[PDB]
Write a protein that binds this ligand. Structure first.
Ligand SMILES: *[C@@H]1O[C@H](CO)[C@@H](O)[C@H](O)[C@H]1NC(C)=O
Lengths: 170, 53
């Protein structure tokens, strides 16, 4: 996409993840554990449903009948009518195809965007206590357990407490 | 012959404005009206070959 997070440096997604859209997956001394992040999920979801709300609704404008199916109208005015209706039908087909194509492009780039926003959030929680993997992982240096991880995923993580160790272990 | 008849009777119509006067003069061959019609309000009109529901 435009942000190179989804189908970018993050190699792929996690079919095992069914809790939300984006999440964390950690492997520390106390074994592997993975769970989803709610704020980003609800952001992207509320935006996509915003698009649907703007689309899924109908006009109140009412159109009458100008021709006849059983008893064909006069030939000239009928050819003018069919010419007008064909031109309009053509226009609405173009408008529809363009609309859907651009709403899809924007949707994809928006989910990509929310991913980059979560990664760049954590990257700023772990100021100097971690190093950039390159595949969307964060190589911590201090001994972060299954409770310090849950302090990351709540943003309650204090980097000054665990700064000494991770700094020295550079 | 159309329904076994060769005659024809063809119909014409005009909308008379409120507080207006229509006036016929005729020499014959005239299918005269007995009842003017008025519109009741608003409606839709469709053409179909399926049942109501
Ligand atoms: C229509 O209005 C005119 C003048 O306002 C009047 O002379 C005439 O009699 C009216 N017609 C009827 C049918 O009342």
């Amino acid at each position: 996409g435009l942000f190179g997070a989804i189908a970018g440096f993050i190699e792929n997604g996690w079919e095992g993840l069914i809790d939300g859209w984006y999440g964390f997956r950690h492997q520390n001394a106390q074994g592997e554990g993975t769970a989803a992040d709610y704020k980003s999920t609800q952001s992207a979801i509320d935006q996509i449903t915003g698009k649907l709300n703007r689309l899924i609704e109908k006009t109140n404008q009412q159109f009458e009948l100008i021709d006849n199916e059983f008893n064909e109208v006069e030939k000239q005015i009928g050819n003018v009518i069919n010419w007008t209706r064909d031109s309009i039908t053509e226009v609405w087909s173009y408008n529809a195809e363009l609309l859907v194509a651009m709403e899809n492009q924007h949707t994809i780039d928006l989910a990509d965007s929310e991913m980059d926003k979560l990664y760049e959030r954590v990257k700023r929680q772990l100021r100097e206590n971690a190093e950039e993997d390159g595949t969307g992982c964060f190589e911590i240096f201090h001994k972060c357990d299954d409770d310090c991880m849950a302090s990351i995923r709540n943003n309650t993580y204090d980097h000054s407490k665990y700064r000494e160790e991770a700094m020295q272990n550079r | 012959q159309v329904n076994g008849l060769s005659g024809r009777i063809d119909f014409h119509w005009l909308m008379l404005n409120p507080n207006d006067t229509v006036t016929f003069s005729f020499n014959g061959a005239f299918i005269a009206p007995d009842r003017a019609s008025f519109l009741r309000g608003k409606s839709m009109g469709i053409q179909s070959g399926v049942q109501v529901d």
